[PDB]
Every structure is written in C-alpha cells, then in structure tokens.
Symmetry: D2
Subunit: 317 residues, 4 copies
C-alpha cells in the first residue's frame, strides 16, 4: 500500500515501501539464486523462463512474491487493494499467474527500462487480494504497471517517485496536484488517506539530504516510510481502501541491502545480497522464517538465520 524512491548523489538510490492489509499476510523472506527454471502456473500454456538474476524477496503466504530486489538492483513492490480490471484468459496465449508477476520481473531484468520494453510486447497475459506492480532500479528509474479495462497500462519515468495502492495512478497524480502549491513545512495533509500519504511521501522524499552517507540516508528513508505508514488497529470499515501497515521494506540499490521491519512484532533486520551465494553452481534456495506476525525476531544482518528450503509453488491453475 505505500511506496517511494529517494535519489541521492553518486547513485545512492533507495526504495521504501509499506504493506497495508486487514490481516496477516503470512510473509516470509526468500533467497532465490540464479538459473532457476520456472513456470507461470497458468495451465498448459504457462510462460516459462530461467532466472538470470538472483533475488531476495518477501512472500505473500509463501505462495506469491509481493516484494523484493535482485542482485542487479531492480526492485519490485506489488501493492494490495488496487482498482484493477484484469483481462479474460482464453488459454491460447502464454499465461502468467499474478502471484509470480513480481518474481518474473525480478528474475529476468536488470533495469526498469529493460522490463518496460519487454512488457510492451504482448506476453504479459496475467491470470487472476487485488494487485498492481511498482518498479525501481539503481539508476533511480521507476514505473508502475496497472490493469485498467482489461488492458495493461504502464507509466514509466524517474519523476514517478511516489505510488500508492489507491486509486489508479493517473488519479493519484490528480489528488496530489493541489499540494504542489503548498509548502510542506507550512501544511501537509495528515490522515491515512492514500492521497495524504502520497503527498507526505512526495514532500519528504525530496527534502531528504542528497549528500553521500548511507547510514544517514537509511535513517531518513525509514523515518519517512514510517511517517507514511497507517497506524495499527485504528482504521474502521467506513474507509475500505485504508488498512493497517503490517510491515515495511527498504531497498538499498547501491549496496544491495534489503531491510525488513514488522509492525506487529518489534523486529527489524536486513539481508545483505553481497554475502549471498546466488550462483547456479552452488547457490541454494533459502528461507528466513518470520512466523505469523513476524514473531521470530532477528536483527542486524540476518543472513546466517537463512535456512536451505525447497522453493514454494506459486499459486495458479
């Protein structure tokens, strides 16, 4: 449910995200080394591929990839509670289960441009917790991919630094517009409305110092995504599009770090991709077991708590 990209000097680029949902999302982290053979779980005409890039990802119920980054610095965030209208699936085109959407992207491409160029070819038939896809890279580039009237719609440009789960993206830009005229040190909208979150993220992302110091940038980036999270247990059924923030992620594109934080358990740590073996030859599929509401606590660089496990099967046909 909320995402933004910060761009500092000397390629110090960072993508942060909050997950908002009404319930436990059953998230564990996974490491997938390169050269994995995969199917889109969309019946006999599922798309197939062999991963080119290793990733570290956050699962949706250990049956989907909902967040993550790859060793090339591409980040993917699948946002929940979106206004989608997905296409019908005949069965005759190559199909891709939406649960694997993010994984396909993370496995196959190094940049947002690479990904967008291929996405505009015709092999994006999604199958089908409603979902849209946000992407960012180490160069600071961004894109969002939506389904509106059964059609894939892509916005692509580094100026799209902030994205929310509701409403559609051309609408999000509209709701933000009023606040481009009002200075963010004088007034900001402070509710948990997606528009309000959007505006605060946009203001704070651009106000972060751009000077090279990763510890500082990280500090400022968390503090901002925390600001834009939805407090827990507070929202009422009167506002269906808002949900409590369950967890947060921060992706350090330069240094290849994936930070994770729980709202339900005091639990914050990160995975360092530079110490992972993502090779075909010896790299293992590994899982970090967080447990329900991330009760299993880790801290610092948590790589050593990763355990060899068989990769889960994506949800599909």
């Amino acid at each position: 449910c909320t995402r933004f990209v910060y761009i500092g000097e000397n390629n110090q680029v960072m993508t942060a995200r909050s997950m908002d949902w009404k319930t436990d999302v059953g998230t564990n982290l996974w490491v997938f080394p390169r050269g994995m053979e995969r199917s889109g779980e969309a019946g006999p005409n599922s798309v197939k591929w062999t991963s080119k890039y290793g990733s570290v990802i956050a699962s949706g119920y250990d049956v989907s990839t909902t967040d993550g980054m790859n060793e090339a610095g591409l980040a993917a965030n699948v946002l929940w509670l979106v206004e989608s209208s997905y296409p019908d699936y005949d069965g005759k085109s190559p199909g891709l289960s939406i649960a694997a959407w993010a994984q396909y992207v993370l496995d196959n491409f190094a940049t947002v441009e690479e990904a967008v160029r291929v996405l505009e070819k015709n092999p994006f038939i999604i199958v089908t917790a409603t979902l849209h896809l946000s992407l960012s890279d180490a160069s600071g580039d961004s894109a969002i991919v939506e389904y509106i009237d059964g059609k894939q719609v892509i916005h692509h440009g580094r100026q799209y630094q902030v994205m929310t789960n509701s409403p559609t993206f051309d609408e999000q830009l509209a709701l933000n517009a009023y606040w481009t005229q009002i200075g963010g040190t004088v007034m900001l909208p402070g509710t948990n409305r997606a528009s309000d979150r959007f505006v605060r993220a946009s203001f704070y992302a651009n106000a972060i110092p751009k000077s090279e110091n990763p510890v500082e940038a990280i500090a400022s980036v968390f503090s901002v995504i925390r600001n834009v999270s939805v407090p827990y247990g507070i929202t009422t059924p009167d506002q269906p599009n808002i949900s409590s923030t369950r967890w947060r992620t921060v992706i350090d594109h330069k240094r290849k770090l994936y930070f994770f934080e729980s709202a339900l358990t005091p639990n914050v740590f990160w995975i360092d991709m530079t110490k992972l073996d993502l090779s075909k030859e010896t790299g293992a599929v590994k899982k970090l077991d967080l447990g329900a509401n991330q009760i299993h606590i880790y801290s610092g660089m948590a790589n050593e708590s990763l355990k060899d496990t068989k990769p889960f099967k994506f949800l599909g046909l």
Copy 2:
C-alpha cells in the same frame, strides 16, 4: 519532544515517547536497583535521598536521566527544547540538579499523585538543553511539571494524555483546540509542528482499541508514536523548535516492559523489569551500551546483554 498515554481495559496502560534533538544524545540504558544513596549535585546543600524503587532508564550523555520507568509502574519522560524560565538558586535551600530530576522522581514515588503531592510542598529548587517533566502511572494518571516565570507549575489529571515539548503546556491545549471541531478521519495536520504532532497523537491515542491484548496494543502504540516522530534530517534551521526524532520508548505499565527503538540504527528491543534483580541485597547497577547512534544492536528481551557497571555521576555543581 512528543509523549502520549494510551489507556485500555483492565489496567492495560502504555506511555510512548519520541526524543527529538538536533544531534546525538549519547544515550545508553541503565538499571538502578533499590537502596541507592544519592545526592542532587547542587553544591553543599544538595538534596539527598535513598531510592525506594528500582528503575530502568535512558540516559542523556551518561550524565543525566531523560527517560524511564520504575518497578511500581511510574514513568518519567524529560522533554527537550521547552520554554522554561528556571528560578535563580541562592545556595541556601536544598538543591537538585535538573539532570537528576527524573531520577529523583522515579526513585522516590510509585504514582503520579504521590509525586505531585510532594512536589507541591517544594522540597527543592531545580538547578541548571532546556527541560520539562512528564509523568504517568499504571493507573493511567498523568502530570507535567514546568518552570514558568521562575515558578514550578504542575498540571495533573488523567485527561492530560498528550504532551509536546513546545510551547508551554497551557499553550499546547490552546493550539489543539481548533482541531476538536474537525473529525480526525477527515482531516489532520500532517507537518512536524508540535501542535500538529499533539493533535495527531490525541486523535490516535483515543482511537486505539481498548480490548485486552498486549501484543496488539503494543503494535498500535508504536505505530502511533512512529507517526508523531519527526523524520530524520529533514528539518531546516527556519523552524528552530522542531528536531529529528533520535529514538522512541514505549513503557508497558502493567507488564513492566521498557521498549527502546533507534532512528539512526535499525535497533529495537526491550528490557523486562520482572527478570531484573532490583534488591538492595543482591542487585547490581547495570548498563546496556548502545554506542553512538545506537550502533550496538540488540533485539527481543535484551536483559542478558546488560553489564555490571559503576553508576555515572549526574551533571551539575
């Protein structure tokens, strides 16, 4: 710089606080068992006392107590950047260095009433960042103690659930007033102005579910104090009363837990007072060394990382 008390059912009371300051505050945690003999470090007429309650506290530069709780469930939060006018100190009356103010309170009293009743009768003159004192109890009671026109001024009542560092507390209630007419699901002020923070804290504190489940309450309480923290590195010298949030505390009054979180390092853990030896007979002074910007990471119940250390000397003379 921002503090609020949440009151749930069955004595599930929680006090949360953010520390806002322009720089490192050099904070480490300390455990002080009962029966410690102390001096107020205010020259020959320093007040003296022997602690009646063990505490766990957060230091200011290992030369002051700026935050903490005691085994009876009294909490003390010393807020920074306040509008004070402290009295002059003739050497003649019993004196108390302000660096030990919070400690004196935590050491001597079990409740906010107990503390207010004694402070009313003027047992000392405070001696002298600028600082004011916020207190809360396991019964949900609250008070704030300020110095205005060289005089100790106390507000005392459970209805005073939210306090900021600026301006004076009477003024804080005034700046909040406008927003009592506007529903918090429709609009909230979203900047880092103390008034804005105040208003969001009051709305969210009362919107938290009151149902008995500590893990849920804790989750909702952090998420709210995080919401009212000031994002890191963002504020400019144009607005002198606002400062980046350096860390947060959450005090669980019922279960006697002290949670601590850093903004500069991913570092979150808690101290469980029920597993500490706070006896005069066999209770040691212990310190948890967090290091500059809390670089030393802990997690979960961090009691075992506490180390026997000689207690620091409070600042003043």
Copy 3:
C-alpha cells in the same frame, strides 16, 4: 455574527460587521439626536438617562438597537446567537432591557474605556435572539461584554480586533490559536464556522495597508467583511450556530460615516453624520425606511432620504 476592527495610520480606524440570522431582521436605520430622554423599559425601576451623543443606528425589528455609531466615534455591534446565561431580575435594582443595551452605550459614552469603567460598577441589570455586545472607538480600542453564568464578563483591549457570535469569547481565542502559527497566504480555513471566519478576519485585518487613503481602506474593509460573511441560503440545520449573512455594516470612525449593505437586495449606501443635525435645539429623530429584506434601494450618501419619524419604543416589560 462577525465583527472586526482595522487600524490604519493617522487614526484611520474602521469597524466592520456582518449580521447573520436565519430570517429577516426587519432592520431600518435611525438617527437620534442628542438630549433624548430615555427609559430602559424594565418596569417601575427602569434605568433612566438623557442621551449625550447623537447616533445613527440599525434596528432589530424597529424595537431594538442592534448596530450603530455615535458622533464621538464609538461603535456598537450587538451580535446574535451567542452562548449567554443572563442574570435573574428581582425588580429591586435599576433594570435595562437588552433591546436598548447598545443604545444606552452609544447615547452615554464617547470611548470604550469610558464605557467599560461605568459598566464594571454595575449600574444596571440586563433584562431579557440571544445577544452579546461588541464595542470599538476612534482610538482603535475594543471590548466585548458577555453574560456567562449570570455574570457580566468584559474583555477590554485594542488587541481584541476580531469577534464572532459563535462560542464565548475566551473559547474564540482558543480556536484561533492554531492558525497563529500558519501564514495566511499559504493556508486559511475557508468554511463558515465562526472559528474559520475569525481566523480569516484576523489575518486580513492585519494585512490591509495602513497608508492613509480612506477610499482604499474602505474598499479593503468591505471586501474583507464580504469574505467573512456566510453565503445566503447555504447552511444546513446540522450546524445550528451558523446563519446566512443578512447585511453588513462598515463604520468609518474618523470621518463619521455609517455604510450599510444588504445581502437580500442589491442595496448599498451610507449615512454621513457630519451632515446630520444632532443638536438638541433643532435636531429631529429620523428614519431611513429599508423595508422587508431592504427592498427600498438607496445609494451614495443617503441622508436626503431620511424622514422625520417618532422614535420607536424599545421592547421589554
């Protein structure tokens, strides 16, 4: 319902007011020269007095004085829909019907200080639209007189430039407080809530140029009181304290001009007190007949349309 004072250089002082009410107020203008003998219409112990200062006033139903000024430059605005608690009237003390309250003040005093000094010592008991009294003078001084818990309460000072007929005056200052921190060119509250009106009036009053040019000042002052009026026919029963603006008044203290404008009829004009005969020796009581909803249109200096009439009898027995 909305009043403000602008203070320019060289004693260019102006008081503006909007009248908000749910229905026709039946207002006509009257001229009362000096030396009129009057009774307070409060039974056998009614206060009695002989006017010292000629006035031009706006009636409430030709049975009360609800607005006006005197030849010395004292202005009185009786605001409607207030939170009053009026005293009981035994019958033993000198009494004054509230319908004549403003008239008594305008007739007897030249300044706000003069008036406050005499009203402090309680020369009468008010006898009972719910009503409170606002005053201003050619020196820029202001006061408001309210009844709270059956007691006369007076606020007196030049700094009280803005008053509403919403909540008690002490509460008005509180609701305004938040907006003293926010620059009025960046954000202002735009609804018809008394607090919102108050805040816009306080900002615009202090932003008007202070350079001596009456035509310009007048233009600015109307434009501001128009801003702060409540649009006609718009308010819903959900907000009982707000009412459509029926008319506006602007008092030029220096030049002794009383401007009047209708919201229900396009009708705007003024009375010039310097061309009226207010002497006891030859001055007549005169009325300008505006009619229901001010259907009788005048323009410019409307003095010539004033007609000799017997003064009305104030309500109350």
Copy 4:
C-alpha cells in the same frame, strides 16, 4: 479572474463572475442593439460580421469587451492573467482582434453549442492583458476556450460549472481534485489562490437551493461570488497570479438581467434587457458611464441612466 454557473429548477440559470486585476480596468457598460456591422480590427483580412443579437457588455478600457450577455441568454466572460500561447498571425487568414473576441461571440450566437460548433472549424485566427474565454447559456451549458501551444483548445459540457483564470483549465480540474474527497462543511481552502477559489465556488454553487425564487437565487449567487472574490489591496508581489477583485457581474439568464457591482466604490445596480430597444430600426448604442473606479453611483434598474453614445473602436491593427 473567477467564474461559476448556478443551475436551479425551471431554467433558473445564473452566471456570476469576479474580475481580478492589479489596477483600474476602466470599465463602463455598453448596450449594443442588433444589426451592427463590425470588423475584427486585424488589418485588411479582418473578419467581418453583422450582429444578430443585442448585448449588454462590460468594457475593458472602452476598447474591448470583457464581459456581458445577449438577448438570447448567452453569457461571455473574458478572464484575465491566463497562461496563453497565442498563434502567430500571418495576415493571410481572416483575423479577429482578441479585444473583440467576446463581442463576436455575443453578437453571432444564441447558445454555447452554436458557438462551439462554429469555433471548432477555425473561422479566424485570434490576433494579439492575457485573456481566455468562458461561455454559458440559458440552458445551463458551459465552455471555455483557451490557447495552448498556439492552438485553440475548447472544453464543452454542462459539468464545467466553475472556471478561474489560472492555471490552464485542465490543470484547474487537477488542483480541485484533492478536495472532492473532503466535505465542504468540514473543510474548505480559504486563501485567494485560484485553486482555493475554484474549490469554494464548486462547493457553494452546488449547495445553493434549486428553488424557483429569483430574489433568493440572486442573493445566494452574489453572496457566493463575493466569497470567492479577492480582497482589495492585500495581495503582495510574492503571488503574481492573484489580483484584487475590481468588480463583479451576475447574469440572470432567464430574466435577462445584468447585475454589476464595484469593489472600489459602493455601487450596485443592474440593467434589464427586456426594457431596452435592441432593434436595428430604432435601437441606439448606449453607454453607462461608471467613471474611474466606478465613482459614478447608480442603483436599482439603472436603464434610465444609459446615454446615447458612439460605439468605441476595438483595439487592433
């Protein structure tokens, strides 16, 4: 600078407008009967036409038509300080001086649809205060015509009830968007920013009662256009797109009344088109001389103060 259309029952349609500018606009009112032969004052290839419909209009500096209505109920409001990029004028195509733009429209068409169908096919090139054109009808229809990237751009639909001078119209709808989520009785933006004015006008226009009672509707409509006017003398050079409101018009489409009000002089009146002779055979060109800052005061139906005058020459070459 601000315009809106109110639509009541039984064809009770009204267009109101504020004119905002930094200085005197030198406006007088004119009556032009039908059958006037006119040139576009754009050199040898000026467009020519013979008026079909009599109009009453407000001039720019007696050299342009900036506001008005015709006997069929078409209204035209030329807004000032717009973001235009006008086309180059060769000299080869039929040309129309922008000063006569509104007049051409009022003279030739009875409805907004009639006007849009002809303007779509480009009968002329506008020849060139920056100006854009707003139109409304007795049927409640609206359109706005702008020049963006040297191209005529038209928005046409009854939904476009509110228009400002800034920014371009597509951008105006965007800046309004945020406030479609917030109820106008709970919060409205209260500054003089065009967006703020836009939002308040859209809310109040739709909240006006739709009853058939012209005096009431008129009252509400003025009160609203007064609300969205920019107070006089208070804007600073820091905000270049905002200007003091100089005057207002209200057009009663059903009854064919043109109301005019000054901000600089207390002066309000109207022209009744049903009592004008607009025939070619006996109708005279007439002018109502308002004078600098509308110092010449009129009131009520001011028709009798109209004086036979030679029509002015539109600016051009």
